[PDB]
Coordinates of N, CA, C and O in Angstrom, one line a residue:
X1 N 17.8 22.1 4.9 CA 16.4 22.8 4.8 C 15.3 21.8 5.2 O 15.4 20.6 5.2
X2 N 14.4 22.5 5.4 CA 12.8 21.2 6.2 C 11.8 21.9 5.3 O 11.7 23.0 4.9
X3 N 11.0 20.7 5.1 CA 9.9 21.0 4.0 C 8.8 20.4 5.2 O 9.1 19.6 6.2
X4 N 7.5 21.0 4.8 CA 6.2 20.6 6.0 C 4.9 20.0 4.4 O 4.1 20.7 3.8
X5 N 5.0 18.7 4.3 CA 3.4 18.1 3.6 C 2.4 18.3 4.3 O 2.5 18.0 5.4
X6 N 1.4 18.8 3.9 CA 0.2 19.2 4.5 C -1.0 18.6 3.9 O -1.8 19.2 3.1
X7 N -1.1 17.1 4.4 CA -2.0 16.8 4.3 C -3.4 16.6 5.0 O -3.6 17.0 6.1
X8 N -4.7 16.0 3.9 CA -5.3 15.9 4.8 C -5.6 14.3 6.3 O -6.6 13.7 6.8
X9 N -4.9 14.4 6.4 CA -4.8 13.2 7.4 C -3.3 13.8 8.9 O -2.9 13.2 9.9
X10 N -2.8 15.4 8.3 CA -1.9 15.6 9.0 C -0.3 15.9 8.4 O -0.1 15.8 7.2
X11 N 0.5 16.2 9.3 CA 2.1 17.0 8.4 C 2.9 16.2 8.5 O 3.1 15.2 9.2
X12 N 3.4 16.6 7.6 CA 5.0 15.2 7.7 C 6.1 16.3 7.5 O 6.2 17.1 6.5
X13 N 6.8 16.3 8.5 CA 8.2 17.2 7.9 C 9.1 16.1 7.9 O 9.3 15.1 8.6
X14 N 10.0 17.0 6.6 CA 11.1 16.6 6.0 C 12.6 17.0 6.0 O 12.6 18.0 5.2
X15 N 13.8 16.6 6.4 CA 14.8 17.4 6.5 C 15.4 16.9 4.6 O 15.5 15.8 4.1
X16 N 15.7 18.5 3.9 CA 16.1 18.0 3.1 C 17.3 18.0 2.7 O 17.8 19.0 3.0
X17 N 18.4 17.0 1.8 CA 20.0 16.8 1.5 C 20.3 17.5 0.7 O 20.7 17.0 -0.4
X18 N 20.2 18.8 0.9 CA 21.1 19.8 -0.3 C 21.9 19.8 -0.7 O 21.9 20.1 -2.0
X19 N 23.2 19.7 0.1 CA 24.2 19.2 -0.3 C 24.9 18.4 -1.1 O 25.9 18.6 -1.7
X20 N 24.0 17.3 -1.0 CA 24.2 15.4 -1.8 C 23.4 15.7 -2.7 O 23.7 15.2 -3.8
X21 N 22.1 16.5 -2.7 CA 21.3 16.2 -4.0 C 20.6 17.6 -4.5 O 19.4 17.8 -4.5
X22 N 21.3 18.4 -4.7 CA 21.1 19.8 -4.6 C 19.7 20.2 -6.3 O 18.9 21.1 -6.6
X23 N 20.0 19.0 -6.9 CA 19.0 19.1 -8.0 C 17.7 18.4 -8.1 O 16.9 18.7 -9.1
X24 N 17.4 17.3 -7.1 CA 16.1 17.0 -6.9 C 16.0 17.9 -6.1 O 15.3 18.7 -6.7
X25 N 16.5 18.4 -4.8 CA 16.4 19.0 -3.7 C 15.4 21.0 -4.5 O 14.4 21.7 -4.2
X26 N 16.2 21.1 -5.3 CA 15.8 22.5 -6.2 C 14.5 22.4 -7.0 O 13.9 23.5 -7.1
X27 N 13.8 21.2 -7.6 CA 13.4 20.6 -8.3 C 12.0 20.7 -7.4 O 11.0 21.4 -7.6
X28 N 12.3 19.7 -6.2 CA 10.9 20.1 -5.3 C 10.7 21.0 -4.6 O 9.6 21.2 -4.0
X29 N 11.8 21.8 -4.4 CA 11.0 23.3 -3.9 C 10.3 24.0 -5.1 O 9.2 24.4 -5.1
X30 N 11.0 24.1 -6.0 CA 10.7 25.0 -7.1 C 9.4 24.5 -7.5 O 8.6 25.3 -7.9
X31 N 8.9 23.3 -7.4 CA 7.2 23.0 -7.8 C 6.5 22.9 -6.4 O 5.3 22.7 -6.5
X32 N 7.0 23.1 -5.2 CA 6.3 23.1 -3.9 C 5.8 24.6 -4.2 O 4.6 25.0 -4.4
X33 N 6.9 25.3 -4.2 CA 6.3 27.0 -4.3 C 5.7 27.3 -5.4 O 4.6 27.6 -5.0
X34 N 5.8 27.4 -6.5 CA 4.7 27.5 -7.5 C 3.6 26.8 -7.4 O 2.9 26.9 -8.5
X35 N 3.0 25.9 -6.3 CA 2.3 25.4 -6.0 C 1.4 24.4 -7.1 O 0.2 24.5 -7.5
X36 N 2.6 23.4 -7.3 CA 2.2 22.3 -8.3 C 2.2 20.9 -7.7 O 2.4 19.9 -8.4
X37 N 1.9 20.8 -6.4 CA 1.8 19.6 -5.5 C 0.3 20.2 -4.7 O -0.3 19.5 -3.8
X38 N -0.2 21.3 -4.9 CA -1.3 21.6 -3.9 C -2.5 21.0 -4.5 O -2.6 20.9 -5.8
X39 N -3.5 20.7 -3.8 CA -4.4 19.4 -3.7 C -4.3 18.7 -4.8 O -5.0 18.8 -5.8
X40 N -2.9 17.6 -4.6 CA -2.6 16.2 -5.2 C -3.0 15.1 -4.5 O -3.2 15.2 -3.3
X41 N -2.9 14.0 -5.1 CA -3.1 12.8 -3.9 C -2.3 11.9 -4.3 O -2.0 11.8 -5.5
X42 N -1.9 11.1 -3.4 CA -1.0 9.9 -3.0 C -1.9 8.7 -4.2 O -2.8 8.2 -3.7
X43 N -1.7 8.5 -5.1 CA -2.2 7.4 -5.6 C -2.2 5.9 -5.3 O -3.0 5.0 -5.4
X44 N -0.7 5.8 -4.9 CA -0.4 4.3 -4.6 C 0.1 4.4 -2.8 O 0.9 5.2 -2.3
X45 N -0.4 3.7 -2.3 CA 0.1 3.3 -1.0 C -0.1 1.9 -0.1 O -1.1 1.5 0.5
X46 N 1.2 1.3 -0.2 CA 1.5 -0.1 -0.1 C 1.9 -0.3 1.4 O 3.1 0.0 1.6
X47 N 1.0 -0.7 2.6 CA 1.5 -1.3 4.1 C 2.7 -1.9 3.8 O 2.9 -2.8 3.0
X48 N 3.8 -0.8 4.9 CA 5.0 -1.9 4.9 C 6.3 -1.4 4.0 O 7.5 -1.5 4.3
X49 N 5.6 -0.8 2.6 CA 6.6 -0.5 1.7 C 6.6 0.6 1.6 O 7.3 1.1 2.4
X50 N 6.1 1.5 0.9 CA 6.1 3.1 0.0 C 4.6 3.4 0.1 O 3.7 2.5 0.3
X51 N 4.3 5.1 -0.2 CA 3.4 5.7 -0.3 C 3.9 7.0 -1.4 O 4.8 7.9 -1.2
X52 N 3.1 6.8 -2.5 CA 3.8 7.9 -3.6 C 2.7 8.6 -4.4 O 1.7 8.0 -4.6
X53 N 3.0 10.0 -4.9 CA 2.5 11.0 -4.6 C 3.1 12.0 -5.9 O 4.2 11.7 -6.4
X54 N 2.4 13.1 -6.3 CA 3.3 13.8 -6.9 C 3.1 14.3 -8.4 O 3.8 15.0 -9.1
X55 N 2.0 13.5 -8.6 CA 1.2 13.5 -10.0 C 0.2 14.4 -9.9 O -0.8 14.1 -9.2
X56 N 0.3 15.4 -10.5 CA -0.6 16.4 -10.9 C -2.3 15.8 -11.1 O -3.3 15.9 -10.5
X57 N -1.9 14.9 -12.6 CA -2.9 13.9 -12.8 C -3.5 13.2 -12.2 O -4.8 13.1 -12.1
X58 N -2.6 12.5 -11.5 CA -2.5 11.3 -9.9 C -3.6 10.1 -10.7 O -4.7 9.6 -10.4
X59 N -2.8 10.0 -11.7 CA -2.7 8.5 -12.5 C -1.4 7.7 -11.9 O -1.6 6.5 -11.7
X60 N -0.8 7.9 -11.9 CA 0.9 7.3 -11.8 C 1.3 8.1 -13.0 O 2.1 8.9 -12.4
X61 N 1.3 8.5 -14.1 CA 1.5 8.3 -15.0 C 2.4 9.6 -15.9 O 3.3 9.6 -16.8
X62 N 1.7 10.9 -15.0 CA 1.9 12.3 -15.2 C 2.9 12.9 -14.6 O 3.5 12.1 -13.9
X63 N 3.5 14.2 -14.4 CA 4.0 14.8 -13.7 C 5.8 15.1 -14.6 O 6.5 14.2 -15.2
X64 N 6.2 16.7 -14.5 CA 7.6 17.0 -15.1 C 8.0 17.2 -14.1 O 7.4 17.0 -13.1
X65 N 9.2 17.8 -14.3 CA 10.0 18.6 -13.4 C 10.5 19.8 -14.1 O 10.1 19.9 -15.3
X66 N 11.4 21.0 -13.7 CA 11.3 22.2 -13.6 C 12.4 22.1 -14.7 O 12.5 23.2 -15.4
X67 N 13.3 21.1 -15.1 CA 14.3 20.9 -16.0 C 13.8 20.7 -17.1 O 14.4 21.1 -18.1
X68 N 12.3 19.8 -17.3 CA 11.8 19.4 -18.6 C 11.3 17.7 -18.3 O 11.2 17.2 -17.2
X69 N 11.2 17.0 -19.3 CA 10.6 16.3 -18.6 C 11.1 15.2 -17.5 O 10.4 14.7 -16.6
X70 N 12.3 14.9 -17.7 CA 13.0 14.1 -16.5 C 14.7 15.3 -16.4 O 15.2 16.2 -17.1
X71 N 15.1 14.8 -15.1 CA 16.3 15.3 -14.8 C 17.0 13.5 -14.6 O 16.6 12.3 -14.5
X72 N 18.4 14.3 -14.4 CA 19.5 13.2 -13.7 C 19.4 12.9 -12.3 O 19.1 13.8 -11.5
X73 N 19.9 11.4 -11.9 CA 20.1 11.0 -11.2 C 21.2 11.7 -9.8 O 22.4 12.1 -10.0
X74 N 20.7 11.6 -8.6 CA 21.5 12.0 -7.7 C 21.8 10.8 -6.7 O 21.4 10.7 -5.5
X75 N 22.4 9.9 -7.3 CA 22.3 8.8 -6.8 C 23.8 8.4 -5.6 O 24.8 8.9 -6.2
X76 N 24.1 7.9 -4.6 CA 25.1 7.7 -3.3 C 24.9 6.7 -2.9 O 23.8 6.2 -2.7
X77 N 26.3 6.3 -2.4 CA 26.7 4.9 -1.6 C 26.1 5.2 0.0 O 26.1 4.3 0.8
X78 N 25.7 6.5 0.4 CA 25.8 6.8 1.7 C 24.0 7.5 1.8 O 23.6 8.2 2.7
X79 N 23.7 7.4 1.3 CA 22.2 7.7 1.1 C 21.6 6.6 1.0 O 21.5 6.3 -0.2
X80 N 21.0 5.8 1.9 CA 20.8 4.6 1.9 C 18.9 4.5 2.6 O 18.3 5.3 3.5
X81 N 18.3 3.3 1.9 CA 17.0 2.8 2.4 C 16.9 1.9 3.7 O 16.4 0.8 3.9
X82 N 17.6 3.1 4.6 CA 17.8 2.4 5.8 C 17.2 2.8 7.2 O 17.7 2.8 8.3
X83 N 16.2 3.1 6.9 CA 15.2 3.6 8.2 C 13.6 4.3 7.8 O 13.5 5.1 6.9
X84 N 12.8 4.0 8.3 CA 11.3 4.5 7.8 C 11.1 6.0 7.5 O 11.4 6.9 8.2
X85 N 10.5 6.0 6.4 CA 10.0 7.7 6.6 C 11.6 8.5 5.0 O 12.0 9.7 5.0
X86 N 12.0 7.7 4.2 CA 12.9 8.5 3.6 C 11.9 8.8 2.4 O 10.9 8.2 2.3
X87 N 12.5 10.1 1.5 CA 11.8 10.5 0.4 C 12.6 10.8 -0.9 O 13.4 11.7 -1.4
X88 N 12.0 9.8 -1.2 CA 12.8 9.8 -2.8 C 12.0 10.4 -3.4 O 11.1 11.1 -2.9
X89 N 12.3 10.3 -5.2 CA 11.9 10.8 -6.9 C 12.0 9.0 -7.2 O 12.8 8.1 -7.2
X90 N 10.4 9.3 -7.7 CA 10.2 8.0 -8.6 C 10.7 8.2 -9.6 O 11.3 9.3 -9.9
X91 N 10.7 7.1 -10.5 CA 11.0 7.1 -12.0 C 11.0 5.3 -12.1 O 11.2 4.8 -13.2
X92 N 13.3 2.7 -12.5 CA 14.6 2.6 -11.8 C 15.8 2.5 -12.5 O 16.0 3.4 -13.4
X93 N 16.7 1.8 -12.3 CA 17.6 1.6 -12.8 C 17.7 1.4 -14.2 O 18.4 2.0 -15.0
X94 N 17.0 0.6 -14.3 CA 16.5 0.3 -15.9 C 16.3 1.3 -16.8 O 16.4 1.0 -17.9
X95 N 16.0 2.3 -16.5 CA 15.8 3.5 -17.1 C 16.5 4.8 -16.0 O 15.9 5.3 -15.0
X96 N 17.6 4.9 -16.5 CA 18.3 5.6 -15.8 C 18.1 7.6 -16.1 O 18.2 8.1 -17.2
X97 N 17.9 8.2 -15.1 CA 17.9 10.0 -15.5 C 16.4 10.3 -15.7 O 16.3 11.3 -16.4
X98 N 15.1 9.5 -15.2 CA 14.0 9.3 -15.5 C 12.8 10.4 -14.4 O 11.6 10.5 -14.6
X99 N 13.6 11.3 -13.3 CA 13.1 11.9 -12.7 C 12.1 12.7 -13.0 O 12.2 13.0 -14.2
X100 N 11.6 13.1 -12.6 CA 9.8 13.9 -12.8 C 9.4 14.6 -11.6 O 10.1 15.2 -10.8
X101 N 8.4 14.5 -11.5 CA 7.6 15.0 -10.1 C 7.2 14.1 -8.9 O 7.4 14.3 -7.7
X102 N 6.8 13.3 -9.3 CA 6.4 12.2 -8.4 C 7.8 11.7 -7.3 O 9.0 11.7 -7.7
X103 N 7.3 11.5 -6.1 CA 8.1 11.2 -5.2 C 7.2 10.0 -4.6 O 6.2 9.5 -5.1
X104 N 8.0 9.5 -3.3 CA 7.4 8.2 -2.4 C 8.4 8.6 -1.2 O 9.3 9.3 -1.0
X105 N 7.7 7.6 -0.4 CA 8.5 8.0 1.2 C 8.0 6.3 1.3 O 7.0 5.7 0.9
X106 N 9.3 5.8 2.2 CA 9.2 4.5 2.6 C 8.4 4.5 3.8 O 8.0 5.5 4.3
X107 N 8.0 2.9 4.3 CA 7.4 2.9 5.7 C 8.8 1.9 6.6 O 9.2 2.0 7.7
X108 N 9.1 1.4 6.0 CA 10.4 0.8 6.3 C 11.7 0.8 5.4 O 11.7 1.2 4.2
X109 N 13.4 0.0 6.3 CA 14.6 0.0 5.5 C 13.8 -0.8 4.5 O 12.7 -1.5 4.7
X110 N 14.8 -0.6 3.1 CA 14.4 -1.2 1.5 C 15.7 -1.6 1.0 O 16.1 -0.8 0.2
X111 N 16.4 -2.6 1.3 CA 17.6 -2.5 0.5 C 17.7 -2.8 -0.3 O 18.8 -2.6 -0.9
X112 N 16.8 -3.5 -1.1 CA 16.6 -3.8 -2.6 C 16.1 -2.4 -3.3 O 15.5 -2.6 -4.3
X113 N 16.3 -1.2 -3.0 CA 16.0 -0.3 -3.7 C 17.2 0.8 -3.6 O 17.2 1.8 -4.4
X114 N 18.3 0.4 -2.4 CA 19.4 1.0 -3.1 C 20.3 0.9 -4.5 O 20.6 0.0 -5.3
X115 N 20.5 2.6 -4.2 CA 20.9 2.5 -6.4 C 19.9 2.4 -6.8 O 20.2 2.2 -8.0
X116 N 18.8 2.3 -6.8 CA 17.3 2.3 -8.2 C 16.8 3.6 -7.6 O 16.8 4.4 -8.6
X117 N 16.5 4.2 -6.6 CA 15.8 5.5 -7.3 C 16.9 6.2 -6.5 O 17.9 5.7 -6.0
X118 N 16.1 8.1 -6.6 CA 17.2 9.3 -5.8 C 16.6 9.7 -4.6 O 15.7 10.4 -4.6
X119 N 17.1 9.2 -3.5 CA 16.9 9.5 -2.1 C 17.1 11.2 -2.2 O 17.9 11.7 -3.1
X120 N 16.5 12.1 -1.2 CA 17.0 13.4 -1.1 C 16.3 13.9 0.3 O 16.3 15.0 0.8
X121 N 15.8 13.1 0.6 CA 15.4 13.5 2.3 C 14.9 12.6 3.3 O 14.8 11.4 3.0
X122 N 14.6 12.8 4.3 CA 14.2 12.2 5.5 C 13.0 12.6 6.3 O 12.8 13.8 6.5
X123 N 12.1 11.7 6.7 CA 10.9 12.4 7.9 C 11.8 12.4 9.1 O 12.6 11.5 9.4
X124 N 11.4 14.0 10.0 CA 12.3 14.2 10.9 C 11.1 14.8 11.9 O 11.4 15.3 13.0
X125 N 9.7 14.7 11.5 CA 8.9 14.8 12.3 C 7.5 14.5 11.5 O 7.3 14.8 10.3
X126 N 6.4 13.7 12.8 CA 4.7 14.1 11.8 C 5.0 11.9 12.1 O 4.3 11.2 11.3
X127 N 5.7 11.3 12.7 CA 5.8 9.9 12.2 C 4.6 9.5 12.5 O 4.4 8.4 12.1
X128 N 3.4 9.9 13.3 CA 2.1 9.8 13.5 C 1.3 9.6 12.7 O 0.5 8.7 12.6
X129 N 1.6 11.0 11.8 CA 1.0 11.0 10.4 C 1.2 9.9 9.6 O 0.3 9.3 9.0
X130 N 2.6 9.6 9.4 CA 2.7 8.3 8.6 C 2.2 7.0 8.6 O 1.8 6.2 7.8
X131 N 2.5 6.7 10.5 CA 1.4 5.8 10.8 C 0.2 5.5 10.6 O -0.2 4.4 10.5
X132 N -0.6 6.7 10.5 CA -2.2 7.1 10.1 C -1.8 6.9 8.5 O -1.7 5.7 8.4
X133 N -1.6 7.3 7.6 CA -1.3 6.8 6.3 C -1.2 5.1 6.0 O -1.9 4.4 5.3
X134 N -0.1 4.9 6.8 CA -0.1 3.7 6.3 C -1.3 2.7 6.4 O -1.6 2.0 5.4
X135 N -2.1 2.8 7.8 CA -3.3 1.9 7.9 C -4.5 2.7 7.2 O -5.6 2.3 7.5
X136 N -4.4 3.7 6.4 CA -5.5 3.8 5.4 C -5.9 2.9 4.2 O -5.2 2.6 3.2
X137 N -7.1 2.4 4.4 CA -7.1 1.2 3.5 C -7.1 1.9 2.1 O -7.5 3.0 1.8
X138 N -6.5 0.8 1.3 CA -6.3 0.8 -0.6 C -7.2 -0.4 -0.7 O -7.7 -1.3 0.0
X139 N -7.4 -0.1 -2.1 CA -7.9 -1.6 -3.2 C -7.1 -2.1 -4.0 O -6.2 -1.2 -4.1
X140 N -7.0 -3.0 -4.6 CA -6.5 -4.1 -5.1 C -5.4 -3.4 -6.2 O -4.4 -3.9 -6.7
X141 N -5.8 -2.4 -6.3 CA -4.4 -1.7 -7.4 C -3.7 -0.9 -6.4 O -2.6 -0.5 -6.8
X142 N -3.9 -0.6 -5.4 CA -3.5 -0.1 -3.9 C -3.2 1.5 -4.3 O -2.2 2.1 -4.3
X143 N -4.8 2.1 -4.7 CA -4.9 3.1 -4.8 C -5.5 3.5 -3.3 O -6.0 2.6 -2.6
X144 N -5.5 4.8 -2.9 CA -6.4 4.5 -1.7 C -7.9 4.5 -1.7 O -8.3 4.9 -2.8
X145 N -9.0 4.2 -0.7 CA -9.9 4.2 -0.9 C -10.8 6.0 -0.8 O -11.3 6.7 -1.6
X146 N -10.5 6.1 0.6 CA -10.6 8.2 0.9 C -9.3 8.4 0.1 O -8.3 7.6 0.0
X147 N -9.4 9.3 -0.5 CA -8.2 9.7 -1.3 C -7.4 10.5 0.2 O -7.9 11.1 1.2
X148 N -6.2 10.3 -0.1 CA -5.3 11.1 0.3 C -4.2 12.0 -0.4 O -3.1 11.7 -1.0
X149 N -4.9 13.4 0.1 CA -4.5 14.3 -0.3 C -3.7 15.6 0.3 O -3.9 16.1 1.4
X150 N -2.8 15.9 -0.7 CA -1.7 17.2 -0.4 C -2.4 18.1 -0.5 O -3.1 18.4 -1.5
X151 N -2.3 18.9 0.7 CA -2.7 20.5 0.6 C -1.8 21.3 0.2 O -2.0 22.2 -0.6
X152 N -0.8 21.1 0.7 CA 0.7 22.0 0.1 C 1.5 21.4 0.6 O 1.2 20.7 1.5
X153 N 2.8 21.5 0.2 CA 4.2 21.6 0.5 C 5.2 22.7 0.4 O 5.7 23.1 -0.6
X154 N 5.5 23.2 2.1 CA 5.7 24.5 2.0 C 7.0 24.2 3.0 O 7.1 23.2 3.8
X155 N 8.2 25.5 2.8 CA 9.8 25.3 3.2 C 8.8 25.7 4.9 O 7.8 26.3 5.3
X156 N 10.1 24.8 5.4 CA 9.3 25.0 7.1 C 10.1 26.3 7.9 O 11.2 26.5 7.3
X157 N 10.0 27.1 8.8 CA 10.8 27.8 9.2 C 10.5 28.0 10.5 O 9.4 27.7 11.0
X158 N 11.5 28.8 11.2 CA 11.2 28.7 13.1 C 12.0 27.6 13.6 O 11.9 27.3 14.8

């Protein structure tokens, strides 16, 4: 399945891993369509590394999931932080089954973050958009400065 972020800076589609992660995968449709991601914003976004997103509050700090407050891990040897644009479920290792709402999408491979969080999809179009994301400037806690913001996240079709 393809998910379309609609933000304001432009769309990012997503192909998502149903198969491998069928419970984050359920997890963010079921709060895309009840529309619990619509005008959120990206709190943290780091040139180079991640841009994460997903907090209702959009502290870092907030956000459930549709299970309660965290779900389990959907974690794979073959689901790997190996090309720009993937989209995990924040929460790491350290605290394992810690999932919520909040997600991030890489700007590059991360192999120090395989095994720490749940990969469940990929950008498979919009890498423009990401580009434009990334060179939006942050401050010093690398919040952004214009906020960037989710209009919706809606299943793509056609």
């Amino acid at each position: 399945q393809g998910v379309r972020i609609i933000t304001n800076y432009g769309d990012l589609k997503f192909e998502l891993f149903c198969s491998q992660c069928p419970k984050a995968c359920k997890n963010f449709l079921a709060l895309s369509a009840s529309g619990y991601y619509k005008n959120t914003i990206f709190h943290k976004n780091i040139k180079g590394f991640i841009i994460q997103g997903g907090d209702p509050t959009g502290t870092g700090k907030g956000g459930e999931s549709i299970y309660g407050r965290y779900f389990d891990d959907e974690i794979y040897p073959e689901l790997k932080y190996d090309r720009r644009g993937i989209l995990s479920m924040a929460s790491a290792s350290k605290k394992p089954n810690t999932n919520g709402s909040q997600f991030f999408i890489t700007y590059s491979s991360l192999p120090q973050l395989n095994g720490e969080y749940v990969i469940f999809g990929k950008l498979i179009d919009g890498f423009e958009t990401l580009n434009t994301l990334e060179n939006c400037p942050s401050d010093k806690s690398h919040k952004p400065i214009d906020e960037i913001i989710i209009k919706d996240i809606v299943i793509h079709s056609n």
